């Protein structure tokens, strides 16, 4: 399924993922596309910070869901 | 002066502040508006995490500056 990630600068990125994909895997996909190291990235969905040891399905993230990316 | 705070969901909040306002005071203003407890909020500006014991002027935050809010 496709998901969207918005940046602090107003950019939107589209990613192809599976509900069984891990958050760490998602961060890795972002690194590949934007060059941002996973340790400097924070992912938020519906006001909650997503953990690297959990999956998309655990957060009930559905197709065309939009995640927010924060930089540290 | 007015400042802007963006959320992980893409929402933008406008706040009225003074350069002498403390970060803790700013968090308190956000709590009043969004109901998010200050202990669950992280404020970032120009890539730096703002501390509760410092003021806006210390970070050279000027009118119409945009801060980023992160949830924990």
From Swiss-Prot, chains A, B:
Source organism (scientific name): Homo sapiens (Human)
Consequence when changing residue 65 to A: Prevents phosphorylation in case of mitophagy. Impaired translocation of PRKN to mitochondria
Site positions (Interacts with activating enzyme): 54, 72
Modification comment: Phosphorylated at Ser-65 by PINK1 during mitophagy. Phosphorylated ubiquitin specifically binds and activates parkin (PRKN), triggering mitophagy. Phosphorylation does not affect E1-mediated E2 charging of ubiquitin but affects discharging of E2 enzymes to form polyubiquitin chains. It also affects deubiquitination by deubiquitinase enzymes such as USP30.
Consequence the record notes for mutating residue 48 to R: No effect on HLTF-mediated polyubiquitination of PCNA
Protein purpose: Exists either covalently attached to another protein, or free (unanchored). When covalently bound, it is conjugated to target proteins via an isopeptide bond either as a monomer (monoubiquitin), a polymer linked via different Lys residues of the ubiquitin (polyubiquitin chains) or a linear polymer linked via the initiator Met of the ubiquitin (linear polyubiquitin chains).
Gene: UBA52
Name of the featured protein: Ubiquitin
Crosslinked residue numbers (Glycyl lysine isopeptide (Lys-Gly) (interchain with G-Cter in ubiquitin)): 6, 11, 27, 29, 33, 48, 63
Top-level taxon of the source organism: Eukaryota
Modified residues (Phosphoserine): 65
Effect of residue 72 to G: No effect on ADP-ribosylation
Section of the entire sequence shown: 1 to 72 of 128
Modified residues ((Microbial infection) ADP-ribosylthreonine): 66
Effect after changing residue 68 to G: Loss of DTX3L-mediated polyubiquitination of histone H3 and H4
Compartments in which it is found: Cytoplasm; Nucleus
Site feature Essential for function, where: 68
Lineage: Eukaryota, Metazoa, Chordata, Craniata, Vertebrata
């Amino acid at each position: 399924m496709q998901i969207f990630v918005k940046t602090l600068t107003g950019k939107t990125i589209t990613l192809e993922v599976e509900p069984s994909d891990t958050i760490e895997n998602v961060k890795a996909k972002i690194q590949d596309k934007e060059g941002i190291p996973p340790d400097q990235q924070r992912l938020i969905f519906a006001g909650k910070q997503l953990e690297d040891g959990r999956t998309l399905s655990d957060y009930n993230i559905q197709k065309e869901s939009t995640l927010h990316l924060v930089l540290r």
